Amino acid sequence: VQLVESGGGLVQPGGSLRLSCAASGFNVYSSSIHWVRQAPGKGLEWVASISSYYGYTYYADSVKGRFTISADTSKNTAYLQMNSLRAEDTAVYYCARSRQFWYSGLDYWGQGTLVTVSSASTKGPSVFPLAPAALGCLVKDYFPEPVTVSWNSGALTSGVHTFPAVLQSSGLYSLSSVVTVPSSCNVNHKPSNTKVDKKVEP
Amino acid sequence: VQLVESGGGLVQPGGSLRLSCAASGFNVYSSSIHWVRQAPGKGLEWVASISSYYGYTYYADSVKGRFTISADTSKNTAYLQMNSLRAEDTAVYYCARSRQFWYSGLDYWGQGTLVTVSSASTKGPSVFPLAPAALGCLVKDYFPEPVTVSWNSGALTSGVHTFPAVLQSSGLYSLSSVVTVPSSCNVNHKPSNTKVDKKVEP
Amino acid sequence: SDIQMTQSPSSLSASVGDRVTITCRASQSVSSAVAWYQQKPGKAPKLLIYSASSLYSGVPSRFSGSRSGTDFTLTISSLQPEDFATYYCQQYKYVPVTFGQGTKVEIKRTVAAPSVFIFPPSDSQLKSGTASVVCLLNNFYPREAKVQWKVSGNSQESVTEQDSKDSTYSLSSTLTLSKADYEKH
Amino acid sequence: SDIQMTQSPSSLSASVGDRVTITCRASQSVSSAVAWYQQKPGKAPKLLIYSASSLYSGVPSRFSGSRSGTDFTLTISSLQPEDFATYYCQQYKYVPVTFGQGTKVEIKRTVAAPSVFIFPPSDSQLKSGTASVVCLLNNFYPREAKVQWKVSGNSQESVTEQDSKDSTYSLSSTLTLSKADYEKH
Amino acid sequence: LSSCSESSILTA
Amino acid sequence: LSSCSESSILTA
Amino acid sequence: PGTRVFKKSSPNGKLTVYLGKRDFVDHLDKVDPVDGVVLVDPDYLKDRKVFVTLTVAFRYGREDCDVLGLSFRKDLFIANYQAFPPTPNPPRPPTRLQERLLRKLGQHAHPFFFTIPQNLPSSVTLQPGPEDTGKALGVDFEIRAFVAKSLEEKSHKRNSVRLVIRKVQFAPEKPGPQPSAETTRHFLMSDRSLHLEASLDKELYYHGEPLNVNVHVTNNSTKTVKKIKVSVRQYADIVLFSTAQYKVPVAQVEQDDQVSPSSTFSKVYTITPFLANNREKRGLALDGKLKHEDTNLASSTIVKEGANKEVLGILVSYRVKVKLVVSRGGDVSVELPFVLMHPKPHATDDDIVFEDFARLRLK
Amino acid sequence: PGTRVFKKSSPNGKLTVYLGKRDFVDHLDKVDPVDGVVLVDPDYLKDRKVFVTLTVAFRYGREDCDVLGLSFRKDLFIANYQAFPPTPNPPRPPTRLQERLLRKLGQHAHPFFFTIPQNLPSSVTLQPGPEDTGKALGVDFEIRAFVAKSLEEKSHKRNSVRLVIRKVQFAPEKPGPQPSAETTRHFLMSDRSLHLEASLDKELYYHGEPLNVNVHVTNNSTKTVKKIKVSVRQYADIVLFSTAQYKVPVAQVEQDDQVSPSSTFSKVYTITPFLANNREKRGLALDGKLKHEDTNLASSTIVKEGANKEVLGILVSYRVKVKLVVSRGGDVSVELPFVLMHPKPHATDDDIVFEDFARLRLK
């Protein structure tokens, strides 16, 4: 039994996106395929469900009239169609599965495809040194996630803390890393193909 | 419209008696014939009823199983049969009539036939003078009612009071009459054919 | 069970032209099945009111009925001089039908003193073995009176009806005793 | 309407081998439609309890559920060293299904003083027109802490997860201000 | 008994 | 609502 | 001097319906309107609407859960009226009884009005048979009141209240023509015939009043009459889609009178229909009952002079049959129609299946 | 660690019935007994008796007052039991669940016991059609409790309580034999024939599990096959007095495969019955519902090895049909019986009239 899904990414606000969940190992008539989204840092939330046996589809009140769920019984897949995406619709979407006869909880889940909506385009990170013991580097105004931060090309992985990125009001992401040295930075942005190396001194 | 009835009299206790109420002026199917008895000195009481249209007969709780009511539609008469007569069954029996469609009270009544039960036989009255102004005669131990009392062959009908008869524990009747004279009796018993004349002096 | 029809008062006194009211009480609720009869002494009853509010055909309009819950009332506006009889209250909604206890209506006059008389037993009566003492009360009012015997039971009283000549009542009381008991005192 | 599933406490700290109890409150009565999921950070949730009392197949017996009216409880007998994740409470009796708010379970250690550090903005950052002040807190406990800025809003704080090496937390606070405002003081 | 159909008095 | 079929908890 | 009123409360006690009457007399040209008042607390519902429905149904089966072919419930007339929230003032104004009820109750009272159409049957009921259980087919009238957000909403037992009314007819004041009939029967070749004359006294007989028939037989022939039979027949005309006429005798009188050849005979009989001896006959029609009370034989159904409609429900009619018994066949009979009334007081599939079922049952 | 229990209270609240279960599994040799507890206040009745009745009925029509041919209510099994005043101790002792309920309640609790006979049908329901209203004919189980002085006393709405239960069956553990069939069709004079072989994979398929058919066609003849059709048929065997077999297709798969003369063909199809595309077909049979919930297709009815009885109620059976389309007639088809079950969790007149009515309706 496997629940493989894909089709996420970045979609402009007000656009459309199509998510597919290719269920395998069971049948679409003996199971009901549900969709669950999780906002970043928040709890789970239910959005849509389909019951192929009875031909019944349900939607959440916050997504009624904008999300349409459908399934192809021949290919044993479930399709979720997103329309009129707003800033509140960005989350990680899972594809659950519950027994039809009878319901006993979502015992099988997918792996989750990240979905984000933003008017900001793709931009390169900027490295700002943090002179002082403690020392670190600051990277701000980059998009999208993620950014890999290495110190001395990963020579010293001890005493290094990389805080998670935070989104400010400008629609861009920014994080920082700090290294503590008693006596005495490589940043890579794969989507933008930017690799900047900087050194910080007192 | 007339409700003529007869068939009463004196019946030995534990015997049987048959009462007939020959209704006239109306129909036995459009009317319900009821029987009502009145104890001497007491109020009215309901004993039996018959509804010729529905073929329904009802009886009082005190006469259930002893009184049977029936009617002959051809002769337009109602028959009440008395069985196991006891000392509590002596009264004057009337034959009422109420509309079948619908009930509006007993608007027509008969004239009443007297019915008495007693183990005592027929006996003659005895005249006892009452010497004194006031004067009178006493008659006791006679059966049955009534007795006509006359003073001086009915010459003086003024100032004469004849009290109603009273039944004592001996099963016989007795009454008295008193005449008041400032300065200065004929008793007849029709059932026993006894006529005794007496005079009372101080 | 049986519906008892409590009718009060037992007997009332009224004068000609006055108003007479008789109340009938039903132990259980009967909708309107109440009939009022009038029975003169010696005759058969005569229907006056049916359905507790309707006047029977051929009946003077002075009679009238009313209903209030389970309280049925018969009212006479002007008491005619011939309306002195006994009135009954009957219900016909549940078998068996139950009648009232009667309400005698008599003419009203002034109070008259009873002319009490005492009659000793005759010699012939004494020789018969049974002795009776006759006490006479004549021309008194009202019907109710108190009588006592002393030389106890063995006493019977007979009261006559109100004679129209004097509008009064007469009572005769007889105290019967054995010859030995009579000779005791 | 929608059934809110109030789950408390929001976050609790426990040691290895202790007992952990999580309570779930339902605004409306659901018979037994309660499921408990476990979500490690970065992975997908995993069903543990269904029907509020049954243990899912392939699940250690230390987990257990119970029901009391509208109060659903998840109890862990012996807290395994790998059972430190987030647990949710879901009801599936009325559409829509509603999940809980989560209950993070973390390891417990002694209180460590924060190594507070203050980092002034760099010259290059100041020349860019935007000035940010970075305040560092390292090796402290618990996660909750109080930070103040004074030379107010325009401050954002990022906190890292509990590293197993030291069982502590690190927080970085950035106060961003314009060049003119930074040069004001 | 049961839930029967009772009555009431209407006046002016 | 109406007269539905509620439940109860049975124990030892 | 206080008029009575009938009322029934909902099982919860919130809903109560006031009705001024229970028997609505039909005057052969109009029906007494169904005027009433509904009492409801606005705080109880506070979002729904109050509806009152008038219905007449050709019901079969018993009232409770029968264990056989249950209530075929073809409906003859359905009406809907809204009490609260209110409707326009008509029709036409509110009545006097409604005004008095509103004064007695207050603001929590809402009236309703219903006009029964002329083209409707009277309330009757077929008499059940000993082999059957409960009751049989018979039209009836009913009034309901319930609270709902729409007319299509399902019924609620806790709020709805059910009341039963009746539609009755009474004897007209105008007497009818004298009913009489004659029938002659000749023979093979001889001019000798068999002449009889029968007649009633009136068109209309009150319930329980005896019927006096005047029979005159002119047997100026050779055959001999052995027995004379006088019968009163009841005709129950079940009409849903196909008319079915059912005959049920209710009273018979026989006498052993012999009529000599070439002689006449005169006699007056007395026959009276009543329910005492017809308590076991299937197909007998009785007057509609309120709850369970005893009722007489069904009154005759009289229609207007211009017969265009009213072929619905159950129709009852009576006819007196006088039959002469003649040796070796040659029976001669006459029928004397008459009415019987109380005096005036001072292509659906299962429908066809049920029609065939009833025809097979009673015939 | 606390088991649940189901209860329902009387409209007045005085009478309440406790039931340990609502689905009573049948084990093909015995039925799980209906053990329960009745709570009643002795002061309320103080002269009557408490009765509990178990009934299974072949009901037609809707639950409320239908406006057409109403509920033909032939009864298949009636049982009566008295709770208070009590009866002898059997059978046989009181059960453990009854003892626990008595301990939980106290003296005001009175148990009752019912044993469902083996010769009874399972709870099913015919699917209503769009032209009809409400529901259709279908057997169901019911438990009632009321207070009365005798069994013949009329029912009371204020005191009686009505509860609905179900009788269900589950998949046996023992697998069945491999289902297969063959059919040959020769021609006028040539020895060339038409041979096809069809087989399933298992006897028992769970609800929703796809069916894989193995079809082998040996067309060593001259004619040509144009189309191949695979269908799953449902047989509803209505049995009251005369057996009536009704066919309702539930799933069909067609492919445009051509079979050349004097050649063979092999392929495996996949067909799955489901309710999404059969929501408008009359005569479909579904599992019994409790109140109004959605239910799947009716499970197959399996009987004991020695078939002597159980010809009652409604019987459901499934068969897979494979049909070969042959030019100018000569159609050849086979039927593959199989069962469909859930896995085990861890001469009355109106009766004949109704039978004819149902036969005319569905056929």
Alpha helices in chain H (DSSP H): 42-45, 96-105, 349-362
Q: Where are the beta strands (DSSP E) in G101-200?
A: 109-114, 124-126, 138-148, 161-169, 180-185, 194-199
Locate the chain G residue with the closest alpha carbon to B54.
Answer: G276
Cross-chain Cβ contact H156/E3 below 8 Å: no
Distance CA C39, CA C47 (A): 9
Distance CA H157, CA H10 (A): 9
Same domain assignment for residues B22 and B109: yes
Provide the sign of the torsion angle of the four alpha carbons G61, G63, G66, G71, taken in this order. Answer: positive
Determination technique used: cryo-EM
Same domain assignment for residues A135 and A71: no
> Which residues of H fall below an 8 Å CB-CB distance to F?
1-9, 11, 18, 20, 97, 100-101, 104, 163
Picking from C71, C86, C107, the residue at the C-terminal end of a domain is C107
Residue H158 C-alpha, separation from nearest chain E C-alpha, in angstroms: 8
Domain containing B35 equals: 2-115
Partner chains of G (3+ C-beta pairs under 8 Å): B, C, E, F, H
Q: Which of F1, F3, F4, F5 to mutate to test the interface with H (most CBs of H within 10 A)?
A: F5
Chain position carrying tokens 């599990």? H209
3-state helix, strand, coil in chain F (%, to 5): 0, 35, 65
Domain count, chain C: 2
Query: In sequence order, what are the residues at sequence separation of 6 or more whose Cβ sits closer than 8 angstroms to the Cβ of residue F10?
Result: H2, H3, H4, H5, H20, H97, H100, H101, H104
Question: Do at least 3 CB pairs under 8 Å connect D with G?
Answer: no
Same domain assignment for residues D119 and D65: no
Token couple for G180 = 């009489």
Cross-chain Cβ contact F10/H5 below 8 Å: yes
Neighbours of G119 (CB within 10 A): 13
From chain D, the residues in CB contact with H2 under 8 A are: 67
Same domain assignment for residues D86 and D29: yes
CATH architecture of residue range(s) H6-168: Sandwich (2.60)
Domain with CATH 2.60.40.640 in chain G: 180-340
Q: Is the peptide bond before D96 cis (omega within 30 degrees of 0)?
A: yes
Token couple for H241 = 């007095």
Cross-chain Cβ contact D134/A138 below 8 Å: yes
57-116 in D: which are within 8 Å (CB) of A?
Answer: 88, 90, 92, 95-102
In a domain, A15, yes or no: yes
Provide the sign of the torsion angle of the four alpha carbons B181, B186, B191, B192, taken in this order. Answer: positive
Cross-chain Cβ contact A44/D92 below 8 Å: no
Neighbours of H240 (CB within 10 A): 21
From chain C, the residues in CB contact with B163 under 8 A are: 158-160, 170-172
- The CATH number for D45's domain is 2.60.40.10
Token couple for A174 = 């920014």
Helix pair G349-362, H349-362: axis angle to 10 deg: 160
Locate the chain H residue with the closest alpha carbon to G348.
Answer: H68
Picking from B115, B141, B159, the residue at the C-terminal end of a domain is B115
Domain with CATH 2.60.40.840 in chain H: 6-168
Task: Please name the helix (run of DSSP H) or strand (run of DSSP E) that holds residue G357, with its range, or none.
Answer: helix G349-362
Picking from C91, C107, C123, the residue at the C-terminal end of a domain is C107
B59: β partners? B48
Cross-chain Cβ contact C45/B106 below 8 Å: yes
Same domain assignment for residues D83 and D148: no
Query: What DSSP designation does A87 have?
Result: G
**H61 in contact with G, Cβ within 8 Å:** yes
Distance CA G73, CA H265 (A): 59
Domain count, chain A: 2
Count contacts between B and C (CB, < 8 Å): 104
Same domain assignment for residues C16 and C97: yes
Same domain assignment for residues A96 and A138: no
Query: In sequence order, what are the residues at sequence separation of 6 or more whose Cβ sits closer than 8 angstroms to the Cβ of residue H144?
Result: H52, H53, H55, H160, H161, H162, H163
- The CATH number for B37's domain is 2.60.40.10
In a domain, B121, yes or no: no
Q: What is the DSSP string of H41-110?
A: -HHHHSSSEEEEEEEEEEE-S-SS--SSS----EEEEEEEEE-SS---S-SSS--HHHHHHHHHH-TTEE
CB nearest to G353's CB, from H74, H75, H353: H353
CA angle B109, B115, B120 (to 5 degrees): 165
**For residue G127, which of G242, G288, G300, G245 has the smallest C-alpha distance?**
G288
Beta strand pairing call for H49-59 and H138-148: antiparallel
Distance CA F4, CA H164 (A): 12
Query: What DSSP designation does G309 have?
Result: -
Token couple for H133 = 């209203």
Token couple for A123 = 């931009």
In a domain, B25, yes or no: yes
Token couple for A157 = 């992985």
Residue H345 C-alpha, separation from nearest chain D C-alpha, in angstroms: 13
Distance CA A84, CA A62 (A): 12
Cross-chain Cβ contact C56/B107 below 8 Å: yes
Q: Are G139 and G294 in contact (CB under 8 A)?
A: no
Question: How far out from the chain centre does Cα C28 lie?
Answer: 26
From chain H, the residues in CB contact with D53 under 8 A are: 1
Resolution in A: 3.3
Chain position carrying tokens 């009184």? B67
Q: Are G283 and G127 in contact (CB under 8 A)?
A: yes
Cross-chain Cβ contact H210/A27 below 8 Å: yes
Task: State how far the alpha carbon of G259 is from the alpha carbons of D156, G268, G271, in Å.
Answer: 128, 15, 21
CB nearest to G100's CB, from E7, E8, E10: E10
Provide the sign of the torsion angle of the four alpha carbons H357, H361, H362, H363, taken in this order. Answer: positive
CB neighbour burial string for A87-110, b if at least 16 within 10 angstroms, e if fewer = eebbbbbbbbbbbbeebebbbbbb
Same domain assignment for residues B109 and B131: no
Amino acid identity for residue D10 in this structure: S
Question: Do at least 3 CB pairs under 8 Å connect A with E?
Answer: no
Partner chains of H (3+ C-beta pairs under 8 Å): A, D, E, F, G
Query: What DSSP designation does G189 have?
Result: S
Same domain assignment for residues D12 and D35: yes
CATH 3.20.20.70 fits H180-340, yes or no: no
Distance CA H286, CA H248 (A): 12
C107: β partners? C14
From chain A, the residues in CB contact with D99 under 8 A are: 43-46
Distance CA G183, CA G192 (A): 14
Same domain assignment for residues A6 and A33: yes
* DSSP tally for chain H: helices H, then strands E: 3, 20
Q: What is the DSSP string of G208-222?
A: T--EEEEEEEEE-SS
Distance CA G154, CA G144 (A): 13
Distance CA A89, CA A10 (A): 12
**For residue H290, which of H24, H52, H48 has the smallest C-alpha distance?**
H24
The 3-state DSSP class for residue C180 equals helix
Residue C135's φ and ψ, nearest 5 degrees, are -110, 125
Q: Are B79 and B95 in contact (CB under 8 A)?
A: no
Picking from D107, D133, D148, the residue at the C-terminal end of a domain is D107
Partner chains of A (3+ C-beta pairs under 8 Å): D, H
Cross-chain Cβ contact E7/G6 below 8 Å: yes
**For residue G58, which of G126, G7, G2, G9 has the smallest C-alpha distance?**
G126
Same domain assignment for residues C99 and C120: no
Amino acid identity for residue A187 in this structure: V
Amino acid identity for residue G272 in this structure: T
Same domain assignment for residues B7 and B52: yes
Domain containing D122 equals: 115-185
**G292 in contact with C, Cβ within 8 Å:** no
Cross-chain Cβ contact H274/A27 below 8 Å: no
Cross-chain Cβ contact H68/G72 below 8 Å: yes
Q: Are A86 and A60 in contact (CB under 8 A)?
A: no
Query: In sequence order, what are the residues at sequence separation of 6 or more whose Cβ sits closer than 8 angstroms to the Cβ of residue G187?
Result: G193, G221, G222
Residue C78 C-alpha, separation from nearest chain B C-alpha, in angstroms: 24
Question: Do at least 3 CB pairs under 8 Å connect D with C?
Answer: no
Cross-chain Cβ contact G2/C31 below 8 Å: no
Same domain assignment for residues B53 and B139: no
From chain C, the residues in CB contact with G4 under 8 A are: 31-32
